[PDB]
Protein backbone atom coordinates (compact mmCIF):
# COMPACT_ATOMS: atom_id res chain seq x y z
CA UNK A 1 0.00 0.00 0.00
CA UNK A 2 1.32 3.62 -0.51
CA UNK A 3 2.40 4.91 2.59
CA UNK A 4 -0.29 7.80 2.72
CA UNK A 5 -2.92 5.19 2.82
CA UNK A 6 -1.15 2.88 5.48
CA UNK A 7 -1.13 6.56 7.81
CA UNK A 8 -4.54 7.02 6.88
CA UNK A 9 -5.29 3.27 8.03
CA UNK A 10 -3.07 3.96 11.29
CA UNK A 11 -4.40 7.81 11.84
CA UNK A 12 -8.26 6.05 12.12
CA UNK A 13 -7.04 2.77 14.17
CA UNK A 14 -6.15 5.14 17.12
CA UNK A 15 -9.70 6.56 17.12
CA UNK A 16 -11.96 3.62 16.23
CA UNK A 17 -12.95 0.66 17.74
CA UNK A 18 -12.05 -2.47 16.04
CA UNK A 19 -13.89 -5.76 16.76
CA UNK A 20 -13.46 -9.73 15.31
CA UNK A 21 -16.59 -11.78 15.83
CA UNK A 22 -14.35 -15.32 15.78
CA UNK A 23 -11.21 -16.22 17.03
CA UNK A 24 -10.38 -19.36 18.46
CA UNK A 25 -9.52 -20.02 22.16
CA UNK A 26 -6.55 -22.61 21.81
CA UNK A 27 -6.69 -25.14 24.79
CA UNK A 28 -3.15 -24.79 25.83
CA UNK A 29 -3.88 -20.67 25.38
CA UNK A 30 -1.96 -19.44 28.77
CA UNK A 31 0.67 -22.00 29.63
CA UNK A 32 4.27 -21.89 28.77
CA UNK A 33 5.16 -21.49 25.23
CA UNK A 34 1.66 -19.99 24.47
CA UNK A 35 1.31 -16.98 27.23
CA UNK A 36 -1.55 -14.30 26.38
CA UNK A 37 0.94 -11.37 27.19
CA UNK A 38 3.64 -12.36 24.95
CA UNK A 39 4.42 -12.30 21.26
CA UNK A 40 3.54 -16.45 20.81
CA UNK A 41 2.59 -18.80 18.15
CA UNK A 42 -0.90 -18.04 17.40
CA UNK A 43 -2.93 -15.44 15.67
CA UNK A 44 -3.53 -14.21 19.05
CA UNK A 45 -1.76 -12.33 21.90
CA UNK A 46 -2.03 -9.44 23.85
CA UNK A 47 1.18 -7.86 22.05
CA UNK A 48 -0.08 -8.91 18.61
CA UNK A 49 -3.91 -6.64 19.53
CA UNK A 50 -1.48 -3.85 20.62
CA UNK A 51 0.27 -3.36 17.86
CA UNK A 52 -2.69 -3.64 15.37
CA UNK A 53 -5.12 -1.74 18.04
CA UNK A 54 -7.48 -4.27 17.93
CA UNK A 55 -10.14 -3.41 20.59
CA UNK A 56 -11.31 -6.82 20.94
CA UNK A 57 -12.60 -10.14 19.67
CA UNK A 58 -15.69 -12.93 20.30
CA UNK A 59 -13.43 -15.94 21.89
CA UNK A 60 -16.19 -18.48 21.71
CA UNK A 61 -16.40 -21.41 25.01
CA UNK A 62 -16.23 -24.43 22.34
CA UNK A 63 -16.20 -28.03 22.56
CA UNK A 64 -16.92 -30.83 19.89
CA UNK A 65 -16.31 -34.79 19.09
CA UNK A 66 -12.86 -34.43 19.12
CA UNK A 67 -11.63 -37.31 16.79
CA UNK A 68 -7.86 -36.27 17.06
CA UNK A 69 -8.92 -40.90 14.70
CA UNK A 70 -11.23 -42.44 17.14
CA UNK A 71 -15.32 -42.13 16.06
CA UNK A 72 -17.65 -39.99 18.35
CA UNK A 73 -18.66 -42.62 21.46
CA UNK A 74 -21.57 -41.55 24.00
CA UNK A 75 -18.85 -40.70 26.00
CA UNK A 76 -17.45 -37.72 23.96
CA UNK A 77 -20.02 -35.65 24.75
CA UNK A 78 -18.79 -35.18 28.28
CA UNK A 79 -14.90 -34.39 27.03
CA UNK A 80 -16.51 -31.77 24.72
CA UNK A 81 -18.04 -30.18 28.00
CA UNK A 82 -13.99 -30.75 29.52
CA UNK A 83 -12.63 -28.70 26.36
CA UNK A 84 -15.84 -25.88 27.21
CA UNK A 85 -14.63 -26.01 31.09
CA UNK A 86 -11.33 -25.15 30.23
CA UNK A 87 -12.18 -22.12 27.49
CA UNK A 88 -13.93 -20.73 30.29
CA UNK A 89 -11.23 -21.16 32.94
CA UNK A 90 -8.59 -19.76 30.41
CA UNK A 91 -11.27 -16.58 30.02
CA UNK A 92 -11.37 -15.58 32.99
CA UNK A 93 -8.32 -16.52 34.03
CA UNK A 94 -6.94 -13.64 31.52
CA UNK A 95 -8.80 -10.95 33.19
CA UNK A 96 -7.78 -12.33 36.94
CA UNK A 97 -4.27 -12.06 36.02
CA UNK A 98 -4.02 -9.43 33.69
CA UNK A 99 -6.54 -6.55 35.00
CA UNK A 100 -5.12 -4.17 33.74
CA UNK A 101 -4.68 -5.35 30.31
CA UNK A 102 -8.03 -7.60 29.29
CA UNK A 103 -11.99 -7.36 30.26
CA UNK A 104 -14.92 -9.12 29.32
CA UNK A 105 -18.16 -7.11 28.17
CA UNK A 106 -21.39 -8.16 29.04
CA UNK A 107 -22.86 -5.42 27.06
CA UNK A 108 -21.63 -2.95 23.64
CA UNK A 109 -21.72 -0.32 26.96
CA UNK A 110 -18.79 -2.60 28.46
CA UNK A 111 -17.03 -3.05 25.17
CA UNK A 112 -16.93 0.15 24.77
CA UNK A 113 -15.87 1.18 28.23
CA UNK A 114 -13.09 -1.89 28.35
CA UNK A 115 -12.09 0.29 25.32
CA UNK A 116 -12.22 3.29 26.48
CA UNK A 117 -10.03 2.47 29.75
CA UNK A 118 -7.29 0.80 27.28
CA UNK A 119 -8.02 -3.19 27.92
CA UNK A 120 -8.36 -5.94 24.99
CA UNK A 121 -12.20 -6.59 25.57
CA UNK A 122 -13.75 -10.23 25.25
CA UNK A 123 -16.71 -10.98 24.27
CA UNK A 124 -17.46 -14.44 25.52
CA UNK A 125 -19.11 -16.45 23.27
CA UNK A 126 -20.09 -20.03 22.44
CA UNK A 127 -20.00 -22.22 19.49
CA UNK A 128 -21.53 -25.34 19.26
CA UNK A 129 -24.71 -27.26 20.77
CA UNK A 130 -22.97 -30.52 20.90
CA UNK A 131 -22.25 -30.53 24.39
CA UNK A 132 -25.12 -29.40 25.97
CA UNK A 133 -27.09 -32.97 25.84
CA UNK A 134 -30.96 -32.57 26.00
CA UNK A 135 -30.26 -29.66 28.64
CA UNK A 136 -32.06 -26.40 27.64
CA UNK A 137 -31.37 -24.77 31.25
CA UNK A 138 -27.69 -24.94 30.21
CA UNK A 139 -28.47 -22.04 28.52
CA UNK A 140 -29.40 -19.81 31.26
CA UNK A 141 -26.65 -21.48 32.94
CA UNK A 142 -24.04 -20.22 30.18
CA UNK A 143 -25.51 -16.57 30.01
CA UNK A 144 -25.10 -16.48 33.69
CA UNK A 145 -21.25 -17.04 33.73
CA UNK A 146 -20.95 -14.63 30.81
CA UNK A 147 -21.46 -15.84 27.39
CA UNK A 148 -23.27 -13.15 25.37
CA UNK A 149 -23.79 -15.42 21.72
CA UNK A 150 -24.64 -18.20 20.91
CA UNK A 151 -24.34 -20.78 17.76
CA UNK A 152 -25.62 -23.60 17.61
CA UNK A 153 -23.53 -25.26 15.03
CA UNK A 154 -20.22 -26.24 13.58
CA UNK A 155 -19.01 -29.06 11.52
CA UNK A 156 -21.43 -32.06 12.09
CA UNK A 157 -24.82 -32.64 12.85
CA UNK A 158 -26.01 -31.99 16.20
CA UNK A 159 -29.33 -32.69 18.40
CA UNK A 160 -30.48 -29.21 18.81
CA UNK A 161 -29.29 -28.32 14.90
CA UNK A 162 -28.28 -29.93 11.33
CA UNK A 163 -24.83 -28.45 10.22
CA UNK A 164 -24.33 -27.17 6.92
CA UNK A 165 -21.30 -29.46 7.07
CA UNK A 166 -22.28 -32.88 8.00
CA UNK A 167 -19.53 -35.13 9.06
CA UNK A 168 -19.96 -38.66 7.42
CA UNK A 169 -17.33 -40.03 10.11
CA UNK A 170 -19.89 -39.17 12.66
CA UNK A 171 -22.51 -41.01 10.66
CA UNK A 172 -24.30 -37.77 9.85
CA UNK A 173 -26.75 -37.43 7.26
CA UNK A 174 -28.06 -33.86 5.18
CA UNK A 175 -30.74 -32.47 7.20
CA UNK A 176 -31.16 -35.09 9.74
CA UNK A 177 -33.85 -32.54 11.77
CA UNK A 178 -35.03 -30.74 8.52
CA UNK A 179 -33.00 -27.53 10.44
CA UNK A 180 -33.70 -27.73 13.93
CA UNK A 181 -35.10 -30.22 16.32
CA UNK A 182 -38.08 -29.64 19.10
CA UNK A 183 -35.48 -28.56 21.28
CA UNK A 184 -33.55 -25.79 19.02
CA UNK A 185 -36.96 -24.44 18.42
CA UNK A 186 -37.24 -24.04 22.23
CA UNK A 187 -33.55 -23.15 22.26
CA UNK A 188 -34.49 -19.89 20.08
CA UNK A 189 -37.57 -18.52 22.58
CA UNK A 190 -34.89 -19.37 25.21
CA UNK A 191 -31.81 -17.04 23.72
CA UNK A 192 -34.26 -14.50 22.91
CA UNK A 193 -35.67 -14.35 26.63
CA UNK A 194 -32.03 -15.14 27.99
CA UNK A 195 -30.73 -11.37 25.72
CA UNK A 196 -28.00 -13.53 23.76
CA UNK A 197 -26.89 -13.04 20.47
CA UNK A 198 -27.99 -16.06 17.92
CA UNK A 199 -25.22 -17.05 15.61
CA UNK A 200 -26.14 -18.36 12.79
CA UNK A 201 -22.39 -18.89 11.10
CA UNK A 202 -22.30 -23.30 10.51
CA UNK A 203 -25.85 -23.96 10.52
CA UNK A 204 -27.87 -25.65 7.81
CA UNK A 205 -29.63 -23.92 5.25
CA UNK A 206 -32.99 -24.76 6.64
CA UNK A 207 -31.58 -24.48 10.64
CA UNK A 208 -31.34 -21.11 9.55
CA UNK A 209 -34.79 -20.49 7.79
CA UNK A 210 -36.14 -21.58 10.88
CA UNK A 211 -33.68 -19.31 13.51
CA UNK A 212 -35.12 -16.24 11.12
CA UNK A 213 -39.12 -17.42 11.39
CA UNK A 214 -38.68 -18.09 15.15
CA UNK A 215 -36.30 -15.04 16.13
CA UNK A 216 -37.73 -11.72 17.80
CA UNK A 217 -34.29 -10.11 17.98
CA UNK A 218 -30.90 -9.06 15.43
CA UNK A 219 -29.35 -12.72 14.32
CA UNK A 220 -25.79 -12.83 13.31
CA UNK A 221 -23.50 -14.80 11.37
CA UNK A 222 -20.24 -14.10 13.29
CA UNK A 223 -17.94 -16.05 10.51
CA UNK A 224 -19.46 -16.37 7.06
CA UNK A 225 -18.60 -15.41 3.53
CA UNK A 226 -20.98 -15.26 0.16
CA UNK A 227 -21.57 -18.63 -2.19
CA UNK A 228 -21.32 -15.75 -4.87
CA UNK A 229 -17.49 -16.04 -4.27
CA UNK A 230 -17.00 -19.86 -3.67
CA UNK A 231 -20.12 -22.43 -4.23
CA UNK A 232 -19.68 -24.22 -0.94
CA UNK A 233 -22.75 -24.99 1.36
CA UNK A 234 -20.59 -23.14 4.35
CA UNK A 235 -21.06 -20.06 2.44
CA UNK A 236 -24.15 -18.33 2.61
CA UNK A 237 -26.47 -17.82 -0.33
CA UNK A 238 -28.18 -14.15 -1.34
CA UNK A 239 -31.58 -15.21 0.15
CA UNK A 240 -29.86 -16.44 3.83
CA UNK A 241 -28.37 -12.96 3.66
CA UNK A 242 -31.60 -11.37 3.00
CA UNK A 243 -33.45 -13.10 6.38
CA UNK A 244 -30.60 -12.26 8.67
CA UNK A 245 -30.61 -8.56 7.26
CA UNK A 246 -34.35 -9.13 7.80
CA UNK A 247 -33.83 -9.13 11.75
CA UNK A 248 -31.76 -6.69 11.83
CA UNK A 249 -28.57 -8.07 12.18
CA UNK A 250 -25.21 -8.63 10.71
CA UNK A 251 -23.24 -10.51 8.40
CA UNK A 252 -19.29 -11.23 9.66
CA UNK A 253 -17.79 -11.65 6.64
CA UNK A 254 -15.02 -14.18 7.75
CA UNK A 255 -10.96 -13.76 6.13
CA UNK A 256 -11.29 -17.63 5.53
CA UNK A 257 -9.01 -18.70 2.70
CA UNK A 258 -10.89 -21.78 0.69
CA UNK A 259 -14.03 -19.78 1.28
CA UNK A 260 -12.98 -16.80 -0.36
CA UNK A 261 -10.73 -18.16 -3.32
CA UNK A 262 -12.25 -21.31 -5.32
CA UNK A 263 -9.08 -24.35 -5.19
CA UNK A 264 -7.05 -23.67 -7.87
CA UNK A 265 -6.65 -26.63 -10.60
CA UNK A 266 -3.33 -27.98 -9.76
CA UNK A 267 -5.29 -28.30 -6.24
CA UNK A 268 -8.13 -29.81 -7.44
CA UNK A 269 -6.30 -32.39 -9.76
CA UNK A 270 -4.30 -33.28 -6.51
CA UNK A 271 -7.38 -34.16 -4.75
CA UNK A 272 -9.03 -35.86 -6.82
CA UNK A 273 -5.56 -38.47 -7.63
CA UNK A 274 -6.08 -39.03 -4.04
CA UNK A 275 -10.00 -39.38 -4.22
CA UNK A 276 -9.27 -42.10 -7.20
CA UNK A 277 -6.69 -44.23 -4.98
CA UNK A 278 -9.35 -44.43 -1.98
CA UNK A 279 -12.46 -45.56 -4.99
CA UNK A 280 -14.21 -42.26 -4.61
CA UNK A 281 -15.35 -40.29 -7.83
CA UNK A 282 -13.95 -37.03 -9.14
CA UNK A 283 -14.94 -34.27 -7.43
CA UNK A 284 -17.77 -31.81 -8.86
CA UNK A 285 -17.91 -29.38 -6.26
CA UNK A 286 -15.89 -28.06 -3.70
CA UNK A 287 -17.91 -29.30 -0.77
CA UNK A 288 -16.20 -32.88 -0.49
CA UNK A 289 -12.70 -31.00 -1.67
CA UNK A 290 -12.82 -28.76 1.76
CA UNK A 291 -13.53 -31.52 3.98
CA UNK A 292 -13.77 -35.29 3.77
CA UNK A 293 -17.43 -35.18 3.12
CA UNK A 294 -18.07 -38.02 1.20
CA UNK A 295 -21.24 -40.03 2.73
CA UNK A 296 -19.99 -43.40 1.93
CA UNK A 297 -16.87 -42.57 4.45
CA UNK A 298 -19.47 -43.33 7.32
CA UNK A 299 -18.32 -47.49 6.28
CA UNK A 300 -14.26 -46.87 6.22
CA UNK A 301 -12.48 -48.22 9.69
CA UNK A 302 -10.76 -45.47 11.03
CA UNK A 303 -7.51 -46.50 10.21
CA UNK A 304 -8.70 -45.69 6.44
CA UNK A 305 -10.39 -42.40 7.62
CA UNK A 306 -7.23 -41.14 8.95
CA UNK A 307 -4.90 -41.85 5.87
CA UNK A 308 -7.64 -40.15 3.60
CA UNK A 309 -8.50 -37.13 5.52
CA UNK A 310 -4.67 -36.69 6.86
CA UNK A 311 -3.45 -36.61 3.23
CA UNK A 312 -6.60 -34.49 1.81
CA UNK A 313 -5.39 -31.89 4.55
CA UNK A 314 -1.99 -31.76 3.24
CA UNK A 315 -3.20 -30.90 0.07
CA UNK A 316 -5.27 -28.01 0.98
CA UNK A 317 -2.33 -26.63 2.91
CA UNK A 318 -0.70 -26.85 -0.36
CA UNK A 319 -2.81 -24.35 -2.34
CA UNK A 320 -1.64 -20.93 -2.59
CA UNK A 321 -3.67 -18.61 -0.06
CA UNK A 322 -6.48 -16.43 -1.29
CA UNK A 323 -5.52 -12.67 0.21
CA UNK A 324 -7.10 -9.24 1.04
CA UNK A 325 -8.35 -8.61 -2.33
CA UNK A 326 -10.88 -11.53 -1.69
CA UNK A 327 -11.72 -10.64 1.81
CA UNK A 328 -12.81 -7.14 0.27
CA UNK A 329 -14.39 -8.56 -2.68
CA UNK A 330 -16.49 -10.61 -0.31
CA UNK A 331 -16.95 -7.41 2.31
CA UNK A 332 -17.79 -5.32 -1.00
CA UNK A 333 -20.82 -8.04 -2.61
CA UNK A 334 -22.20 -8.58 1.09
CA UNK A 335 -22.72 -4.71 1.06
CA UNK A 336 -24.02 -4.83 -1.85
CA UNK A 337 -26.57 -7.10 -0.73
CA UNK A 338 -27.42 -6.16 2.40
CA UNK A 339 -26.37 -2.78 2.79
CA UNK A 340 -23.26 -1.00 4.99
CA UNK A 341 -25.33 -1.24 8.38
CA UNK A 342 -25.19 -5.50 7.83
CA UNK A 343 -21.62 -6.15 7.27
CA UNK A 344 -18.97 -7.03 9.21
CA UNK A 345 -15.41 -8.76 9.81
CA UNK A 346 -13.95 -11.95 10.93
CA UNK A 347 -10.84 -13.92 11.03
CA UNK A 348 -11.60 -17.38 12.04
CA UNK A 349 -8.10 -17.16 13.51
CA UNK A 350 -6.42 -20.06 15.27
CA UNK A 351 -9.37 -22.55 13.72
CA UNK A 352 -7.36 -21.57 10.08
CA UNK A 353 -8.05 -18.04 9.36
CA UNK A 354 -5.95 -15.26 8.11
CA UNK A 355 -5.56 -14.95 4.41
CA UNK A 356 -2.10 -13.30 2.95
CA UNK A 357 -1.40 -9.81 4.10
CA UNK A 358 -3.82 -10.35 7.48
CA UNK A 359 -2.19 -13.31 9.13
CA UNK A 360 -2.77 -12.15 12.89
CA UNK A 361 -4.99 -9.23 14.84
CA UNK A 362 -1.70 -7.39 15.04
CA UNK A 363 -1.88 -6.78 10.99
CA UNK A 364 -5.82 -5.87 10.89
CA UNK A 365 -4.72 -2.14 9.81
CA UNK A 366 -3.93 -4.01 6.58
CA UNK A 367 -7.59 -4.57 6.26
CA UNK A 368 -8.53 -1.06 6.61
CA UNK A 369 -5.79 -0.31 3.97
CA UNK A 370 -7.66 -2.41 1.39
CA UNK A 371 -11.16 -0.90 2.80
CA UNK A 372 -9.55 2.72 2.12
CA UNK A 373 -8.46 2.08 -1.41
CA UNK A 374 -11.57 0.62 -2.56
CA UNK A 375 -13.24 4.10 -1.20
CA UNK A 376 -14.72 3.06 1.81
CA UNK A 377 -14.99 6.16 4.03
CA UNK A 378 -14.16 6.08 7.53
CA UNK A 379 -17.75 6.44 9.38
CA UNK A 380 -18.00 3.26 6.69
CA UNK A 381 -15.36 1.26 8.03
CA UNK A 382 -15.99 2.18 11.72
CA UNK A 383 -19.36 0.33 11.10
CA UNK A 384 -17.61 -2.93 9.36
CA UNK A 385 -15.18 -2.99 12.82
CA UNK A 386 -17.39 -3.32 15.22
CA UNK A 387 -19.84 -0.63 15.06
CA UNK A 388 -22.79 -2.52 13.11
CA UNK A 389 -22.24 -5.71 15.93
CA UNK A 390 -22.39 -3.37 18.79
CA UNK A 391 -25.85 -1.85 17.49
CA UNK A 392 -27.30 -5.25 16.78
CA UNK A 393 -25.92 -6.62 20.21
CA UNK A 394 -27.53 -3.40 21.87
CA UNK A 395 -31.06 -4.76 20.34
CA UNK A 396 -30.81 -8.11 21.13
CA UNK A 397 -30.25 -6.99 25.26
CA UNK A 398 -33.47 -4.52 24.73
CA UNK A 399 -35.66 -7.97 23.48
CA UNK A 400 -34.90 -9.84 26.28
CA1 LIG B 1 -17.18 -34.62 33.47
CA1 LIG C 1 -9.91 9.37 7.62
MG1 LIG D 1 -1.91 -46.61 2.97
Excluded: C
Aim: aromatic share 8%.
Amino acid sequence: YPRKVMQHAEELHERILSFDSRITVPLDFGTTGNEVDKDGPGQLDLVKAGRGRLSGAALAIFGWPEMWPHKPTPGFVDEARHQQEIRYKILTGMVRDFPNQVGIAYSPEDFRRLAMEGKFAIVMSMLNAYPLGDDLSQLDKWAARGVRMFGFSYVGNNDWADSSRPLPFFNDSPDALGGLSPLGKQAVERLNDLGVIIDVSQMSTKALEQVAALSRAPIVASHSAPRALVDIKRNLSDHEMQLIKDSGGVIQVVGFPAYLRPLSKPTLDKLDALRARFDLPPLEGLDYALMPGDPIITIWPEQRFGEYASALYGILEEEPKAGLKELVDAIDYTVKKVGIDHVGISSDFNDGGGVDGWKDVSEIRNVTAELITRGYSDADIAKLWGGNFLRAWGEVQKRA
